[PDB]
């Protein structure tokens, strides 16, 4: 119904104008922890009402899209969209830190973790007797203000004793060794292949259509799980101006329940778990065992988008369980009253690397995040 939005005075940029294309999350003095000055983000939009916000660039080369995807920071680091308002960061160590009287918050890092063997380490910069830190994993489905480990959209690690967190529970299944002022956490994160995820995607597609489905009309909800294709995307990611500058209204998933498919053999509720996942920490580079073999297979049918039930059923219309370039588990980091911990990206700053063959940092997948997001929308241009 609405037209595309044209270019403005900061959009078409001169050669010598080295201004940056989305406006910087500007730094302002919050508190002074670790004898450093940490800084906030002031005028940027933040993820609320089950939505998110993303920088766009005024791309001139296309006809249908006048905006395509881009990023601020050159390497990976904490995403600025999942942030609180009393949460602070720096350009020195990139640690997230809430205030001295602020509560339990969290920030994800924007690596989109779907398949392969991906590994990154998490610096534990400081801990006190009153400060707690929960570094771990969480999805794009799970939000930032809750400390993760609240649901099955993410699992985290406890501060002392490493009691591995799931739905608020504290499982002591690894080797317990508490964080100190010079510690580090290395998430050896084995995910199986995207072909292994795609056949679990048809497993929830084929068992929600007609196995238990005999509400008043459920064939039109069967049809969205009928056309529930393993990688295919129905994205509504449009560009909006906001606080005089350009951003995205990108859709975000809504909270759902536990996928319990009745296998006839197990005579009970059977759960969807991935093909041999592994959740290992590197506290100073020693093997601690495997916590989670049960990371979820999620991409079309396990997370439900922002979809309309009454406006849309009368009629063209999108599908309920689809994909995008943003779905995956994310490098997550939580803080409590100023528990300072940092994410560590590249192998030159990695201190305790495993001998592996498939050691992949964020920046391999982050460069793949830059290169796919353009060409996921170069199919949108037709």
């Amino acid at each position: 119904s609405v037209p595309v939005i044209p270019y403005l005075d900061y959009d078409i940029v001169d050669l010598g104008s080295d201004i940056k294309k989305p406006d910087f999350p500007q730094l302002s003095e919050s508190h002074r922890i670790n004898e450093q000055q940490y800084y906030i983000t002031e005028d940027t939009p933040l993820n609320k009402r089950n939505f998110m916000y993303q920088p766009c660039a005024a791309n001139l080369m296309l006809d249908k899209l006048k905006y395509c995807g881009t990023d601020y920071f050159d390497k990976s680091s904490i995403n600025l969209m999942d942030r609180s308002d009393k949460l602070a960061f720096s350009l020195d160590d990139h640690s997230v830190s809430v205030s001295e009287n602020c509560g339990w918050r969290s920030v994800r890092s924007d690596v989109c973790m779907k398949e392969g063997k991906i590994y990154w380490e998490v610096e534990v910069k400081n801990v006190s007797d009153t400060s707690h830190i929960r570094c771990g994993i969480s999805r794009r489905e799970a939000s930032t203000e809750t400390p993760v480990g609240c649901d099955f959209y993410g699992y985290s690690i406890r501060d002392k004793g490493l009691q591995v967190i799931h739905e608020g529970r504290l499982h002591t299944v690894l080797k317990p060794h508490e964080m100190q002022a010079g510690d580090r956490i290395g998430f050896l994160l084995t995910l199986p292949s995207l072909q292994s995820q795609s056949e679990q995607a048809m497993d929830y597609s084929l068992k929600r259509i007609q196995e238990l489905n005999n509400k008043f009309n459920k064939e039109f909800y069967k049809f969205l799980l009928r056309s529930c294709e393993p990688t295919n995307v129905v994205r509504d990611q449009i560009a909006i101006r906001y606080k005089n500058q350009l951003f995205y209204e990108s859709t975000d998933y809504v909270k759902t329940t536990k996928p319990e498919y009745y296998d006839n053999r197990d005579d009970m509720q059977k759960f969807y778990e991935l093909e041999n996942s592994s959740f290992e920490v590197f506290v100073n580079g020693v093997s601690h065992g495997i916590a989670f073999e049960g990371l979820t297979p999620f991409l079309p049918p396990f997370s439900e988008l922002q979809y309309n039930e009454k406006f849309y059923l009368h009629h063209e219309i999108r599908n309920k369980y689809v994909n995008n370039n943003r779905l995956g588990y994310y490098a997550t980091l939580s803080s409590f009253q100023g528990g300072t911990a940092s994410i560590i990206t590249e192998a030159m700053e990695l201190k305790f690397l495993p001998k592996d063959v498939d050691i992949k940092t964020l920046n391999d997948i982050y460069n793949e995040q830059i290169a796919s997001d353009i060409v996921w929308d170069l199919i949108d241009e037709i």
Binding site: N101, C102, G103, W104, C150, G168, R169, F336
Partner: protein
């Protein structure tokens, strides 16, 4: 007293502020005196009755003046005993009846006076100093081993004159000594009288402060402060030095600058007398006053009434102010209210007056043989009173309770 152990958070006042009862007594009154606890109010009624009220349901339990010794004319003042067992009642029917509530309708021993009275004051429960009108001595009447010999002890030395001072109109005993009696003349002067409980008396203290008819002399219950109410418009609180040997000095003067009213009655606070009340005389003065007895300022006003209030009483247990509105006759009464608490619905509620910013802790996401004694009673209440004296409960009339459905 266990209601005040449960009522507040722990803050309880030192004067009542609001007025919550009103005794609908259509025949008017002269004096209102409580019991030495808060239970019983003796009402000195105008025609000659005494309609004693139970202070829990505002409807009476007895009437002293049925069997023997009813007052024909008005009854002027009354006091009670140490325990609340007896009543010593001074009236205008020329009669001072010592009543006892063991027989709650009959007098025990009377005295036909030479004329009317003003007041009465007891030192022990039997001996009582009375103010015979137009008499420059105080014939204190004592109930002796026999009741009949009311020894009219003249409260004056045989040589001493108060010629030029008039008659003695007020006599109030000392709280802490219990043997030196402060009296005030009809013209200015103040005497002291050390009764030996033999009958030697010493005029240790005499003076004149200002020429007036001294309507009232009160002493604070710590024996420190003594206030004088003249027939002019002033209240002189004085400080008392008794080791006997007595001398006073001027502490403060309280007046009404606006209307210049006379103060009818004055009364002090409980412990050391940190608050002075008064009731003014002229019409449109509709309210008892309060004063901080050190600074001197008008600090609060008991604005509850509609008439002029004549007499006063402050019992310290229930913290009430009883006062007869003289025009209508009804006994106005003030009481410390306690607002209700929903915090006692479940054993953990809380009534916070503001939207508190509770800090967010970690817990929100996680999933005997003491000494026991049964024998002793209580020793001190929250007010800090003389409690652990189980008082003389006035028995209800168990001689004629069966009759009380039929014809009074």
């Amino acid at each position: 007293a266990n209601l005040l152990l449960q009522d507040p958070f722990g803050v309880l006042k030192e004067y009542p502020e609001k007025l919550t009862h009103t005794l609908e007594v259509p025949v008017a009154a002269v004096c209102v005196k409580f019991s030495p606890r808060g239970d019983y109010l003796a009402v000195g009624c105008s025609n000659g009755a005494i309609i004693i009220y139970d202070m829990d349901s505002l409807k009476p339990i007895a009437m002293l003046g049925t069997h023997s010794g009813a007052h024909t004319r008005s009854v002027q003042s009354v006091c009670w005993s140490n325990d609340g067992r007896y009543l010593w009642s001074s009236g205008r029917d020329w009669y001072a009846k010592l009543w006892d509530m063991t027989q709650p309708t009959k007098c025990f021993q009377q005295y036909k006076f030479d004329g009317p009275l003003w007041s009465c004051h007891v030192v022990r429960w039997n001996v009582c100093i009375v103010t015979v009108v137009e008499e420059p001595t105080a014939y204190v009447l004592t109930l002796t081993d026999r009741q009949n010999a009311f020894h009219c002890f003249p409260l004056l030395e045989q040589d001493q004159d108060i010629s030029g001072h008039g008659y003695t109109l007020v006599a109030c005993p000392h709280p802490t000594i219990e043997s030196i009696i402060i009296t005030g003349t009809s013209k200015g002067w103040i005497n002291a009288f050390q009764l030996d409980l033999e009958d030697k008396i010493r005029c240790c203290y005499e003076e004149k402060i200002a020429n007036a008819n001294i309507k009232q002399i009160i002493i604070s219950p710590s024996g420190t402060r003594i206030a004088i109410n003249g027939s002019d418009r002033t209240i002189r609180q004085y400080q008392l030095i008794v080791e006997h040997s007595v001398s006073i000095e001027l502490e403060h003067k309280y007046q009404d600058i606006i209307n210049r009213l006379q103060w009818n009655t004055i009364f002090f606070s409980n412990h050391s007398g940190e608050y002075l009340v008064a009731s003014a005389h002229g019409s449109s003065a509709h309210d008892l006053y309060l004063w901080e007895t050190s600074s001197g300022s008008l600090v609060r006003v008991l604005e509850g009434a509609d008439e002029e209030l004549l007499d006063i009483d402050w019992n310290f247990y229930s913290m009430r102010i009883a006062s007869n509105g003289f025009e209508s006759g009804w006994v106005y009464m003030w009481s410390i209210v306690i607002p209700p608490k929903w915090s006692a619905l479940a054993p953990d509620f809380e009534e916070v007056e503001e939207n508190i910013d509770y800090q967010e802790k970690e817990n929100e996401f996680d999933i005997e043989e003491i000494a026991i004694d049964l024998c002793t009673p209580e020793k001190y209440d929250v007010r800090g009173n003389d409690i652990s004296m189980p008082s003389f409960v006035i028995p209800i009339d168990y001689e004629g309770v069966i009759i009380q459905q039929h014809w009074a």
